[PDB]
Amino acid sequence: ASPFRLASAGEISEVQGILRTAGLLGPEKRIAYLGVLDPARGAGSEAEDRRFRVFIHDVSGARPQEVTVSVTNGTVISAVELDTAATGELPVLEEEFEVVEQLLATDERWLKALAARNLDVSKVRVAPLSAGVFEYAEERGRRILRGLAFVQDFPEDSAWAHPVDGLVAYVDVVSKEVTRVIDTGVFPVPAEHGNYTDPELTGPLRTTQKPISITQPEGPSFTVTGGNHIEWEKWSLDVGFDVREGVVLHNIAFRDGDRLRPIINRASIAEMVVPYGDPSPIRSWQNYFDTGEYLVGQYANSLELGCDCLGDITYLSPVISDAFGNPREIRNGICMHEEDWGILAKHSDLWSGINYTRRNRRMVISFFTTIGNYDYGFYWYLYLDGTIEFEAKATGVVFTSAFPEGGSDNISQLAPGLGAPFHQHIFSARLDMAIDGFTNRVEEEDVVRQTMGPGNERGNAFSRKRTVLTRESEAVREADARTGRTWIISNPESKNRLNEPVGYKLHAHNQPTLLADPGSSIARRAAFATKDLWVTRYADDERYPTGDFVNQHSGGAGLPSYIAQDRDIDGQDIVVWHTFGLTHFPRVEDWPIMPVDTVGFKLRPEGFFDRSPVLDVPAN
Amino acid sequence: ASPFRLASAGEISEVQGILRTAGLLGPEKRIAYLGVLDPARGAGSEAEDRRFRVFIHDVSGARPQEVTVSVTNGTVISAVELDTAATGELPVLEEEFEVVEQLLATDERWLKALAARNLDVSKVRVAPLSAGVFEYAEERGRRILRGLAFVQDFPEDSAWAHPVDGLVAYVDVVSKEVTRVIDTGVFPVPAEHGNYTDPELTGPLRTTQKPISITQPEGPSFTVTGGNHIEWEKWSLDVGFDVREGVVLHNIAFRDGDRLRPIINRASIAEMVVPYGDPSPIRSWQNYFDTGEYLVGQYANSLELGCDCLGDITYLSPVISDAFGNPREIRNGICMHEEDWGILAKHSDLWSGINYTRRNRRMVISFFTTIGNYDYGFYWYLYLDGTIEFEAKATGVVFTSAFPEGGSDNISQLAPGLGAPFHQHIFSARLDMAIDGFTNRVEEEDVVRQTMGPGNERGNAFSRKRTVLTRESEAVREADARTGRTWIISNPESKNRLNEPVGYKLHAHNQPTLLADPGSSIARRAAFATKDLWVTRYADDERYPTGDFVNQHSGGAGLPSYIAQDRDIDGQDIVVWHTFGLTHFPRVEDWPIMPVDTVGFKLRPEGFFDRSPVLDVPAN
Ligand SMILES: [Cu+2]
Ligand SMILES: [Cu+2]
Ligand SMILES: [Cu+2]
Ligand SMILES: [Cu+2]
Ligand code: NA
Ligand code: NA
C-alpha cells in the first residue's frame, strides 16, 4: 500500500487500457516514455492517486502527446500535443535504432562509399546515434539519427575493432529516408580483431585464481517489505525504478533513537552526457545523453548471480512498458546486498587498557546498463556511520575511429591504425534534500589560511568559512579543491544538542567539468555540466537538468531556465544538482575491453547526530 | 637467501652482540632506531652483505652515535658521534614517554596548577608529546617533551574526554628536570565521560547484524616464499618492515608474458605529520611527525583475526629491537589477503551476441599503528589490471581541548565544554620508481581546453599537454584539479608496441596541502608538505623528506636541501615524493571515538602494456 512502490505489470497494462479507451493509443501510436509520478508534496492522510506520465509518439508523423493518467481512477488527467521543433523530440525508440542500418543498406551513396573501401554491405554494422542540434535546418521538427559504420568480419566478431572512418550518414527514422551521406575520404579500416573471448588473443586462461566465497548463513541483515521498502542498520528507504533515470532512491531516512529522521527525499542520476572531443566532422556532433535521449533504465541488464553481484543477493525485477504499452520485466535488474567495509573505528588506549575495534558495513543498491558499446554500473551505498555515497562504474568497449597518420591532439592510438577519440562521461545527481525535513539551506565551506602575526605568532592557525547561498542566482558554484571546498546542507530550524543546525556535507571528487567551448551546441544543451553544483527551489516540473525532452533539443530548458526565477533557497524546500564526471584519454590498456573506472561523490553527517551513531554496533 | 628478507630475531641479537663487542653498547646506551639497510644499486652477482643502521642514545647525556653494522661479517662499518643541536635529536624512546607524568607529579608548579583546578594528581594523565623547535633557547641540544594533562576518573575511563586546558609543561627527559610549567588560567574540565564501551552511553547493542562469512576453501591465490616474497596474479614483490616507516614494499614488478617487468623499486610512507591549527599557546607547538619522531612501526598493533582483518589472512610477524638491542616480535603485525573488488570489465554486445563479465580482485598488505590517542591503518593494494594504490585510514580518539566560551575559529565543539582543535594529517609517499627499469622521467599532464574557431568549428575539441620535468629545480609541483592534472612516470628507452614510452600515471586526490603560514616553524620542518609532488635524483642517503633526525630539528635537511643540487631527472634513476593529507575540522560524529576517514593515491598503467593485461582472467 506504499505510494512509493514499484510499478506493477498490472498498472502498466492498465495505463495501456486507459489510453486505449480514451482514443490515445491506436495502432500508429508508440510509447516512448512511461513512468510513475511521485506523490505531490503534503500527500499525508489524503488517499493515494497513482499517476503515470506518458510520452506518445506517432509513426505516421502526427504530433506526439504528453499524457498523465490516473491508474487508480481509470482516467486521463491531461493530454497535450507537443511541438517537437520547439520543446524537443521524444526519446529514441528501440525500434528506430534498427532502421538506420537497414535503410542505409539500399542507399546508393552509402553503397558507393562502402565500395570505395572494398567493404561488403552485409558485414557493415551501423551504430545509430543521437543527432543533437547543429547547422542542418531541415532536421528541425524531424527525428534524425546519425550512423557510423563498423565492420563485423563474422557473427561473433567485435565490430568496434574495425571503424570505417571518413563516413557518416543521417537518417529520418519516421519518413524512413536517408537525408545525407558524408564521405570525407577513405581511411584504412583497422584490421586486428578485438575479440576478448578468442583464445588466440587471451592466451591460456589463468588457473591461479582460487575461489572467494561470500555467504550469509542467517541471511542478510536488511529486510524488504512492500516489494521495495528497505530497512537496514537504522536506515529506511524505498528503491524506485524509472525507465529514464534507472534506480531512484526515495525517503532516505535514519532511525536515531525513537525518531525516523529524513535526510534525502529523492536521489537520482537525472542526466548523463558523454561528449566527444574530436573535431573531425565524422564525430564532432557526437554527444550521448544516455539518460535523457536513450533512457538508461530501458537498457538495464539482467544481472547473473555469482557474476555481476556476489554474495547473498536480493533482486528486484522492475517492470517497464514496451513501445505498445505492454509490461516487460527486467529480471534481476536491481541488486541489493550488504558487504563488509573494513574497520569502522579502532582505538587501543594505553591509559584505560581497553582495546576496541569495530567493523564497518555498507548497503549496496545497484544496476548496470548497456548503451551500444558502453556499459555503466550505478551504485548507491549507505554506511553504518550515516554516510551516503554514489559511484558510477564505466566499462564496455571504447568508441573507436581511425588513428590519423602523423598523430592527433584529440584521439589516442589503441592498436595499429586504431584510434579512440577523447571524451568525457559527466553525470548530474539530483538530490531533493530533506535534512530533518524540508526546511533546508546550503553553505559553501572553504578552508581559510591565516597570516603569521598578532593572535597567531607561531603561524600555525587555520580556519574555515561558510557562505550561505541565499537565492538561486547565487547558487551556481564551482569546485575549489585547493581550498578544500565542500557544500553543507543544513536545517536552520533543527539543532543538535550543541545548539548548531544539523547538516550533511557533500564531498565532491573535483574532477574537471565540461571542457567544450562555452559557445558550443553541447555547452548549451548540457549547461548543467559546466558547473559543479547548482541549488534550486523545489518545483514539481523541474525534474531533469536538461529538461523533459533532450533529443534534438537546443538550449532553452533545464537548469539555466530554472534558476532565472531567482527564488529564495535560504531555509526552503531545495534541490541540489551535483555535476561530476570522468575525462577519458583512452589508453592501450582500455583495448579491447576496458577495465572499470569510477567516479562519484558522498555526503557525510555534519553535526546531524549528537555523537557518533555507531556506538551501539557490537564486537565481532 | 633473498637480500630483501625481513630482519630475523637472530640478526637483531647479532647486531647487539657486534655493538657490545665493539664497545658501543654499554649499560648507559639505548637503541633509539635499528633497521636493515637496503642493498646498494647494482648488487647483482656480488655476495650479500646484510647491514643494519643504528642510532644509539646515551642516558648519561653523552653524545649519541650513528652506527652501521655488517651482521653478515660481524663488523662495525662506521660509527660517528652526532651533534644533536645541529643535525637533530634521536627519535623519542618509549621509556622517555613515562618520565613526563612521573616527574610532573612531584613538581611544585604542576601541583599548584592542579590544585587550582581541584584535580587529584593521582588521576591526571599526561600526554607526553614531541616538542618541536620554537623560541626556547635552552632546549637546543636537549631532549624535551611537552606534556598536556587529561583527567582519568577511574582505571577504565577515557581521559581524552577531560582535557585540562590552560596548562602545559616542558620536561628534559635525560636530566629528568621540569624546565617550565605554563598556566594561562583555568578552564572548566569537561565533565561528560567518553566511554564508548559503557552501556550507559552505547545503549543496548544492536542485534540486527547478521554474519558475513568470507572464506577461501582452497586457500589464497597468493604464495609466500622466503618469509616475505609475494607472488599473486602476475605481481611479484617483497614485503619489508622498518621500525620507522612500517610496511615498505620492495621490487614491485608484473609478469607480462615471459618477462618480469619492474614498476616500483621501493614504496613507503617516508613521513607523516599532524600539525595543529589552534593558536592557543597551550597547543600552538603541537605537530606530530609520527614516522620521523615516534617511529610508526614500533607501535604497530597485533591484529586479531575476524576483527582487524577479515577473510583468509596470512600474517607476518616482524621483529624489531627494544631499547637494549634485544629482539621483540610484533605478532600478527602485518595482514596479507586477497579480496573481491566487484566488476573488472563488462560488455553485453548486441552485434556479436556475446555477454561478458569478469570480476576484479586486489591484494591487500596492511598494518595498524597507535600513537597516543590516534590509530592509523596503512593499506597497499595491487589490482588485477596493474593499478597500485595506497590508502591511509585515520581513527582513534580526537585530541581535545576546552571549548572556549563564545566559540572559536580554530576549535570545534564535540560535547558540552569539550573542544577539538583543527588539524591536518599529511603523508609523504616516497616512490623509488623503476618503470621497466631505472631510466625514468616524469611529465606533468594537464587537460587543455580549445577555443571554437578554425579547426574546431563546433567548439567541441579538447586535448592535453605533457611537460617533462627535466631537472630537480623544475620538479616541485602543485595540484590543479580543475585541469585534471596528473603526473606520468615513463621509461623513455622502453617502448610499447605502438612505439610510445611505457608509463604509469599518478592520480592524486588533490586535497589541501600544509595550511600553516610559510614562515612558521612547521612550514620549515615539514616543507615537503607544502607541495603535492617532488622529484629527486636517487641518492642512498636521501631517505626521508624531513631528513634522518626530525625530533627537535629545524629546517636545513630533507627535500629542500636535496633539490638544490638541481640534478638531471630526465631519463635517470628518480624518486617521486607525493604529499597527500586530510584536513580535519572535527565534528560531533567523531566523538567519543572517530569513524574511519581515508586518504590516498593510486598509479594506473599508461601505455605500459600492449593491450589490457586481464584478458586471461577466467569467467566466474
Ligand atoms: Cu574482425
Ligand atoms: Cu570513456
Ligand atoms: Cu570521566
Ligand atoms: Cu584528525
Ligand atoms: Na528538498
Ligand atoms: Na628510481
JSON list of N, CA, C and O in Angstrom, two decimals, chain B residues 589-602:
[
{"chain": "B", "resi": 589, "resn": "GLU", "atom": "N", "xyz": [30.08, 13.91, 15.28]},
{"chain": "B", "resi": 589, "resn": "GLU", "atom": "CA", "xyz": [30.10, 12.47, 14.96]},
{"chain": "B", "resi": 589, "resn": "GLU", "atom": "C", "xyz": [31.44, 11.76, 15.19]},
{"chain": "B", "resi": 589, "resn": "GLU", "atom": "O", "xyz": [31.50, 10.52, 15.27]},
{"chain": "B", "resi": 590, "resn": "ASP", "atom": "N", "xyz": [32.51, 12.53, 15.32]},
{"chain": "B", "resi": 590, "resn": "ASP", "atom": "CA", "xyz": [33.84, 12.00, 15.62]},
{"chain": "B", "resi": 590, "resn": "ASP", "atom": "C", "xyz": [34.03, 11.63, 17.10]},
{"chain": "B", "resi": 590, "resn": "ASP", "atom": "O", "xyz": [35.06, 11.07, 17.46]},
{"chain": "B", "resi": 591, "resn": "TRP", "atom": "N", "xyz": [33.07, 12.02, 17.93]},
{"chain": "B", "resi": 591, "resn": "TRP", "atom": "CA", "xyz": [33.14, 11.89, 19.39]},
{"chain": "B", "resi": 591, "resn": "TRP", "atom": "C", "xyz": [32.13, 10.82, 19.86]},
{"chain": "B", "resi": 591, "resn": "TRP", "atom": "O", "xyz": [30.98, 10.82, 19.39]},
{"chain": "B", "resi": 592, "resn": "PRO", "atom": "N", "xyz": [32.46, 9.94, 20.80]},
{"chain": "B", "resi": 592, "resn": "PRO", "atom": "CA", "xyz": [33.72, 9.83, 21.55]},
{"chain": "B", "resi": 592, "resn": "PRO", "atom": "C", "xyz": [34.83, 8.97, 20.95]},
{"chain": "B", "resi": 592, "resn": "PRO", "atom": "O", "xyz": [35.91, 8.89, 21.53]},
{"chain": "B", "resi": 593, "resn": "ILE", "atom": "N", "xyz": [34.57, 8.32, 19.81]},
{"chain": "B", "resi": 593, "resn": "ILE", "atom": "CA", "xyz": [35.60, 7.57, 19.09]},
{"chain": "B", "resi": 593, "resn": "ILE", "atom": "C", "xyz": [35.26, 7.79, 17.62]},
{"chain": "B", "resi": 593, "resn": "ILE", "atom": "O", "xyz": [34.09, 7.77, 17.23]},
{"chain": "B", "resi": 594, "resn": "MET", "atom": "N", "xyz": [36.27, 8.03, 16.82]},
{"chain": "B", "resi": 594, "resn": "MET", "atom": "CA", "xyz": [36.02, 8.52, 15.48]},
{"chain": "B", "resi": 594, "resn": "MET", "atom": "C", "xyz": [35.85, 7.43, 14.43]},
{"chain": "B", "resi": 594, "resn": "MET", "atom": "O", "xyz": [36.65, 6.48, 14.38]},
{"chain": "B", "resi": 595, "resn": "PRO", "atom": "N", "xyz": [34.82, 7.53, 13.61]},
{"chain": "B", "resi": 595, "resn": "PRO", "atom": "CA", "xyz": [34.72, 6.63, 12.45]},
{"chain": "B", "resi": 595, "resn": "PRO", "atom": "C", "xyz": [35.87, 6.90, 11.49]},
{"chain": "B", "resi": 595, "resn": "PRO", "atom": "O", "xyz": [36.38, 8.03, 11.38]},
{"chain": "B", "resi": 596, "resn": "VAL", "atom": "N", "xyz": [36.31, 5.86, 10.82]},
{"chain": "B", "resi": 596, "resn": "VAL", "atom": "CA", "xyz": [37.44, 5.94, 9.91]},
{"chain": "B", "resi": 596, "resn": "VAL", "atom": "C", "xyz": [37.19, 6.96, 8.85]},
{"chain": "B", "resi": 596, "resn": "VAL", "atom": "O", "xyz": [36.09, 7.03, 8.30]},
{"chain": "B", "resi": 597, "resn": "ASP", "atom": "N", "xyz": [38.21, 7.76, 8.58]},
{"chain": "B", "resi": 597, "resn": "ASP", "atom": "CA", "xyz": [38.25, 8.57, 7.37]},
{"chain": "B", "resi": 597, "resn": "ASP", "atom": "C", "xyz": [39.50, 8.22, 6.58]},
{"chain": "B", "resi": 597, "resn": "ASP", "atom": "O", "xyz": [40.44, 7.68, 7.14]},
{"chain": "B", "resi": 598, "resn": "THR", "atom": "N", "xyz": [39.49, 8.46, 5.27]},
{"chain": "B", "resi": 598, "resn": "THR", "atom": "CA", "xyz": [40.54, 7.95, 4.39]},
{"chain": "B", "resi": 598, "resn": "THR", "atom": "C", "xyz": [41.11, 8.99, 3.48]},
{"chain": "B", "resi": 598, "resn": "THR", "atom": "O", "xyz": [40.46, 9.98, 3.13]},
{"chain": "B", "resi": 599, "resn": "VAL", "atom": "N", "xyz": [42.35, 8.73, 3.07]},
{"chain": "B", "resi": 599, "resn": "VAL", "atom": "CA", "xyz": [43.00, 9.49, 2.02]},
{"chain": "B", "resi": 599, "resn": "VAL", "atom": "C", "xyz": [44.09, 8.61, 1.40]},
{"chain": "B", "resi": 599, "resn": "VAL", "atom": "O", "xyz": [44.53, 7.63, 1.99]},
{"chain": "B", "resi": 600, "resn": "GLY", "atom": "N", "xyz": [44.46, 8.91, 0.16]},
{"chain": "B", "resi": 600, "resn": "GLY", "atom": "CA", "xyz": [45.41, 8.07, -0.53]},
{"chain": "B", "resi": 600, "resn": "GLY", "atom": "C", "xyz": [45.76, 8.61, -1.92]},
{"chain": "B", "resi": 600, "resn": "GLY", "atom": "O", "xyz": [45.66, 9.82, -2.21]},
{"chain": "B", "resi": 601, "resn": "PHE", "atom": "N", "xyz": [46.23, 7.71, -2.76]},
{"chain": "B", "resi": 601, "resn": "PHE", "atom": "CA", "xyz": [46.58, 7.97, -4.14]},
{"chain": "B", "resi": 601, "resn": "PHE", "atom": "C", "xyz": [46.68, 6.66, -4.91]},
{"chain": "B", "resi": 601, "resn": "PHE", "atom": "O", "xyz": [46.67, 5.58, -4.31]},
{"chain": "B", "resi": 602, "resn": "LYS", "atom": "N", "xyz": [46.72, 6.71, -6.22]},
{"chain": "B", "resi": 602, "resn": "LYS", "atom": "CA", "xyz": [46.97, 5.49, -6.98]},
{"chain": "B", "resi": 602, "resn": "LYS", "atom": "C", "xyz": [47.77, 5.78, -8.21]},
{"chain": "B", "resi": 602, "resn": "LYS", "atom": "O", "xyz": [47.88, 6.93, -8.61]}
]
